[PDB]
Amino acid sequence: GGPSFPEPKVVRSQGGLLSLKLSATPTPLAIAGQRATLLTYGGSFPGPTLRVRPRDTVRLTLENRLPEPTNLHWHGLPISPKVDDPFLEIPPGESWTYEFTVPKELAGTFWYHPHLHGRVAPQLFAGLLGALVVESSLDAIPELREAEEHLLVLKDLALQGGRPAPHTPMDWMNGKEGDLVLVNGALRPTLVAQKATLRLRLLNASNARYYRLALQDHPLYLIAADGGFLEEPLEVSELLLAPGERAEVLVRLRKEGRFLLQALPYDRGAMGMMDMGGMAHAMPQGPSRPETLLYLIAPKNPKPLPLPKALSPFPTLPAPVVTRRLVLTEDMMAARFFINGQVFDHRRVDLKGQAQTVEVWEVENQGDMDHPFHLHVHPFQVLSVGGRPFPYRAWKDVVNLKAGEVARLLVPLREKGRTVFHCHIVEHEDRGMMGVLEVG
């Protein structure tokens, strides 16, 4: 009813339970004015949005109908690595049921995708991704209850012969970006706002593309990061989202009109082919060209709601017991990527920590590309990057590091078990940039 806007179908918990059988299958679909066969969850691209509340039980049976093995990563969920098992392999024609309980204080936008080492980048690029939304009591305050809410899944694509384009040697080095820059699987959709205040949940599910988001004539009011709410709204003129990151923002439409949401130029350090070249620029790729993500039409006579005065206080964390240093490095021509000089070995435990303690992790990017660092299972607080303070307090699970930047993270260790940390330019994860944490 009303104007339509492309957005994944939502599956909601009922009576405290979200039970769903989700098949991973090659699927012919309509895409940007053409037909292409993608790999999808639940027959759609993006996959369905799972919407739950804290304390819900999720029982998701993943039916592997792919020609290769796969698994799921429950990205951002602070659950057991025995459930969110990065080492599990589901063979073709087999199923696996993931069962877990939504933590009581959790809120925000999360997502699910494959995590079978060696095949993450082709599988995610082919379309296997979906969102998970955890509702909050805070969603009931009038300043959020009356906002018009939408999910925006930012994910690019490239097609060749009616199927996802193959990975090239350059893609393994830079990570693969596509020429079709899509929102919720649609090319430059139009959102005709019925309310003057919007609450946009934002998900970068791309392999490697960065989204330097800006809305014409409007600031954004950041109310949530990857893994939960900020303590109060933070006004920004623009918002960079690296692969794997999420945010939620309020938009306050002041005037009537049509406003572009853009991904402004951003140079993440990707490298071009050659050396033999023109005069000054042809080695690095340089900044991305600007892209139009969607058109936003304000309602008539728009009168936005007041911003909420507070959101969620951020828990004070105990003093840390351990300091760790994780150094990221690259060998670009070999397209090999390292942490503390090693490539991932699933039979090698790299860090051993104690459950119910807090550590500080210093993650240092000694490469020339941006690398977005992700830690499974244990959300963290970013204290500083480059020795300067982070701009807000909120749970994160991906932190972007530009060349030479060192991030200092407070990592509370929660669930026992063996889990992983890795770059979320998933090509780099496939090519080495992953290590193993064991919590006891």
Ligand SMILES: [Cu+2]
């Ligand atoms: Cu992820």
Ligand SMILES: [Cu+2]
């Ligand atoms: Cu990387």
